[PDB]
Amino acid sequence: ASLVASIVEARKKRTAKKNITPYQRGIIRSLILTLDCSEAMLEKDLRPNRHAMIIQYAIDFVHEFFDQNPISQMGIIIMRNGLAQLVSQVSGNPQDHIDALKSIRKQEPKGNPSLQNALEMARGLLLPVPAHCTREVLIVFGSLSTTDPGDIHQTIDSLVSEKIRVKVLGLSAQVAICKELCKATNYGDESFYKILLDETHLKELFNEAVTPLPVNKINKGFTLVKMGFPTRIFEDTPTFCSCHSKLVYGGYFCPNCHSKVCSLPTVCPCCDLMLILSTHLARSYHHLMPLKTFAEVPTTEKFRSEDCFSCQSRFPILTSSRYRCEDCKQEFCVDCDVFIHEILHNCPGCESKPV
Amino acid sequence: DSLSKEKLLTNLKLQQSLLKGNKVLMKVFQETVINAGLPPSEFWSTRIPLLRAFALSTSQKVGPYNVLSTIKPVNKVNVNLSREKILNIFENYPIVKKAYTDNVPKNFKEPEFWARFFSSKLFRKLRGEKIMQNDRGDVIIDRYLTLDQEFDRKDDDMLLHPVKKIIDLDGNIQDDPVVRGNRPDFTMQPGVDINGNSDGTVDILKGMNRLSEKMIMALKNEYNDERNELKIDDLNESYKTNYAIIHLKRNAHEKTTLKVSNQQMLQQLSLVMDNLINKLDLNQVVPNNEVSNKINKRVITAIKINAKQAKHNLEVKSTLPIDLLESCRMLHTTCCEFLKHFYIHFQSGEQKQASTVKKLYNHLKDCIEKLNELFQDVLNGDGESMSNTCTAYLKPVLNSITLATHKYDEYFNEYNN
Amino acid sequence: MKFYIDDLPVLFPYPKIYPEQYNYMCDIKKTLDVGGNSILEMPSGTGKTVSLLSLTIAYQMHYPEHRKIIYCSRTMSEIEKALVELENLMDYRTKELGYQEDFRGLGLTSRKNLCLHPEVSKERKGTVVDEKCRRMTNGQAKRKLEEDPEANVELCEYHENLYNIEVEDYLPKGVFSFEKLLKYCEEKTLCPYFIVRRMISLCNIIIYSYHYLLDPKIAERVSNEVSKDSIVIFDEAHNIDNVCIESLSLDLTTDALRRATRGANALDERISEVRKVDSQKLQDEYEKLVQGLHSADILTDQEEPFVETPVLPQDLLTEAIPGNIRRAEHFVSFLKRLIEYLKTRMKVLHVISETPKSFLQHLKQLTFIERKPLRFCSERLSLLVRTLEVTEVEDFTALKDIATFATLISTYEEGFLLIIEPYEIENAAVPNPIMRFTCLDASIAIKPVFERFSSVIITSGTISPLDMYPRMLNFKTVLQKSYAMTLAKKSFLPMIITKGSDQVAISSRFEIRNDPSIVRNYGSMLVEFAKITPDGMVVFFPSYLYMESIVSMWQTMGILDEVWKHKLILVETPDAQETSLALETYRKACSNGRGAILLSVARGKVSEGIDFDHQYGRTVLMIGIPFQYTESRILKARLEFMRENYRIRENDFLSFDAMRHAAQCLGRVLRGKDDYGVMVLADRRFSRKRSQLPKWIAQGLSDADLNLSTDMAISNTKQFLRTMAQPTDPKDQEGVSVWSYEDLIKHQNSRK
Ligand code: SF4
Ligand SMILES: [Zn+2]
């Protein structure tokens, strides 16, 4: 009787994903993850302790964020002992923040949090940020309270005025002030103050936070942006780099001012212009071109085919596991459905079918 | 406040502060302004986010907390004092700050003072301890008892404020001023001692309430509505996102900077299906060892070329003298700084930038000549044994610099000429 | 949203509605059709006031009777709540119809709440406030200032402007809040008390306290300008019997006796001086008493009676004053020998309890004072004060109290008793004797109400059982049923903590009150719930002394220092004003989310009109059974009388009152269905009382919850928080809990 429970669970899951929309979603991102390292995360209540798992999950989050969206800079400020401590400036290299987080590994989480100080200096760090960049902050929190020097509502008003959004991933339960932050910052939405139920749910939440977010019509910033593809050289001689001032065998060359750099996707240090590859911009095209869900045909009706169109395996036989791409009119197995919907980003049935 | 570009450029003390924090910043700044004489405003003009980050790092302060509650009495007692917590006590209790400042710089020592403080009954009163005449306290600290009492009265006077009638229990109990009933129970009324006086639990409870009020008014610092208050949001319309979807019209330009026929391909197709059903031999695939030898030549040539590519797969190890290595790295660094500032001036595009562009052009020319003179030095220091490698190492930044000079000259001829 | 009942159009200011609200409206309209009274119990977590207000407004507008509306509550807080919701409803109706209908409705309260005379405003005793207002606007002052403008007896310019403009000119139509009325009277310099006193005949709906309906002194005026066939509704008056008891109960202290002696001597010497200088006024008063005129006969409206009418007007004496007290000196000697008799009876050595008839017999045995003068005393004293012009009335308030006592005890004999005990405080340095007057019944004061009005609605949220109130009060209702909670999912989690962390039971008994182990348990789960509580938590001990002891000795352990590190702690001050500042502090602390804890008595001033919601109502630490003080002779006499009357088990009634107080404590968590909260029961003895408990409360009380400890209480609370931290699909409640207009239509057709 487990298949009926699985079916009704899949129905209640798919009721949320019935509506799939091609919203304009931010690509030039600006993501900040502040960390609290206080007495609360010293609890071993989840194995091994909250501090260790948020360290590991932040490592994964950095990797996933830079993989999916390499067109953003990442800054991390830790919270400790009534002080918020900047440990990671916004940068194109994830490895810097990886090393900073590795430093955060060995140190000891202790103290009390101050979202006022944390968000204030996060605002100040987010101040010299260009218009197209979408300023947004992830906040992790384990306390049920917050010691603060002054008002939080002035900070809330300033953050709303400066067009920065937040998303809170609280640990224990809901905190009303964090709900207020999420609602007021997020145009009244309640889809940003999220509480886990276990570590797997925390993993899923982090994966959810990886994704780009849609933007609002009223928050209109539709413009152009100057861009430059550089050229890579492979020279015999080591050559001084502009950024780190040291001898480099290879390195890309600046398209505009003909200097050289060491890493991409990065902006020029000399002509001060952003340099990318077409792979980097095409990386988010699945977000730009979403994929429709695939429908299982019912077991009662007559079937177009009895084996999987894509992976080429036999469909198993009570119910019918034939997920149909209505855009290509072909049914598929669950494994192929998962792979095409998540790993792949094209429908080979729609590739074979001519338009 | 201290947030404008002008304020950040003005704070010379903060500039010196993060200067003294770094060491390569003395190196860079010394070469930039001490050695090259660049305008230090334009030096700091790039490092404005770093300056603001340093300022905001230095600028934060903690929130209030119950420091006396965190004080523990801990046989004997050994003082283990923390200066930040001492100042926390000072800020939380200006009476204790005053008692420090009129006694320690006048009469006795700081650890002696804090031993007297922990001995004092004023400490117990300010903490969550009921005062007792069995305790003797410290007389010097306990002279401040009435001063703290009148501080409490003045603070309560400040803390008084009018109350909203929506929640005013005083208005609630002033509903009926002529309630004539019976005297309520001793159990539920505030109990007293035998002689009618109170024990003082009402005093300690109003004191901790005063602590709460002081904390919330510290929050409420420098740094009608009931219609909104009584809204029942549970029976209201759900909020829906106004996020805009996006379509995509698709019309791409063809790639810019003989035709086969169905009959002919069908004829060839018929012929090759005939050949396919006719025969297929794996053994004929073996080549003629001469055109195959040319294939060997091509393959081996590709291997040699890409192997020489792979032959040049901390920086690289070099046989430079270390001092000259540092000097040339320094010259490369300051040349890069000059070039970046010149590009900042050039891409700015103002007539106000013109003298700056000219002067940085002169500085770039000077850097060019100094690079050449350095090349003369490594010339007569090596006999061009590795002075060639020195020139090649400093080459690409020089090429970019002189390209920028040519660009400046060309735009000068474009506009002026 | 707007729909039709069978003949009734009705508008709801929200698109959504609850089926429980629909059934509530159905039964209320059934009651209004059939005439009389009914008792309905509903879970207070659903919206009540807006729904009943909408039904009443629709009833008045649609039906050609257009009967007025009488709604009464306990506090200014509840009154302001009703005002705000009424304003919202009428605004919605105005928007829906596209125009504003003619409407009038206001509240009723004290000058202490209201008198905007800034000089009078700076007093704290509302009695003094009212007295000063009479002193400078009594009409006598106005006449004296009119004949002599040089006289320095000023008049209230607010009152002067209200003299200038007319009663309909006082306000535009509609409903105005206390705050809106404050703004309006601030603009126009008007006395809102006087305004309200002239709005009485004009308001379509009138709202005031239960006291203004129950106490005869502040109720005869309300009965004067009220329509006999209006609509009467009551809300959350399940503890109104106490108000009924105090409506006719009184106490006697030594210092009050001293003040009465001093006031009588002052009045006697004033009467001697007046007889010396001008006996014309005294002779005029004496002959007016010979004709037998009364307070309404002689006094006008602008002058008020000094001794207000202590008894119900159905029982007053309306004949002439006897000649034995008719003269001023005769009446002074009468009062003085009454005082002397009271001083003789004052000095007993033990507990004395006799019938008022027996007291009257003893009095007529010793002195020679009869029930007719002993009833006429208050009226005669008011007339003597009016004639005497003795407006410095400080020494004579004890005289008012003693005349009130004399009139009250001379009025009734059954269901009333006098208690004399030689100690005002038993456990003091010295005993202090006391006379305590009581009213053993409670249904006395409701008789004018029930026999003056038929359309009277008695309903609440925490009334259980329904029949016990017609048992205790001689009245009957047309229908008696409750409402179950039609809940889609669980939102309230009650627990019964029958044992501590060490499986050690806990109780609130005053003998075992200073038990260190019970202290250790109490502080233990107090700490644990403080650590796991996100926003706001309240604690309700049964008694203030119980608090003061147990908080002082946790202060000795320094547990409060640990509690400091997570939330603030707020304690019910004996000062209501400091308590108001404290609750504001708690409000702002839960507003900024740093978190705070309230400490208030179960019967304390917080518990009777303050709600807590969505961060304020999140978790409540109810402490033990809130039993009353056991060794009250007053309570025992009540128990004896009610058992003799209605065959009531005494311990069962005590448990009744305790659980009803507990329900009143715990009912202030769930404002809307979106809210959630957890309930604790911190006594072992509660397990037998789920059958006593209200039905919708106990329906969430599962059988596994009947005996829990700290550990699984903590685990279940954490899991409840985890549960309530999740979103919910609207499809699971779109037709079972939240109803659209079409949902209500479909349900109505299904009923059809
Ligand atoms: S005249 Fe009006 S404002 Fe003045 S005391 Fe009387 S009610 Fe208050
Ligand atoms: Zn480099």
Ligand SMILES: [Zn+2]
């Ligand atoms: Zn460049």
Ligand SMILES: [Zn+2]
């Ligand atoms: Zn497949």
Ligand SMILES: [Zn+2]
């Ligand atoms: Zn397809």
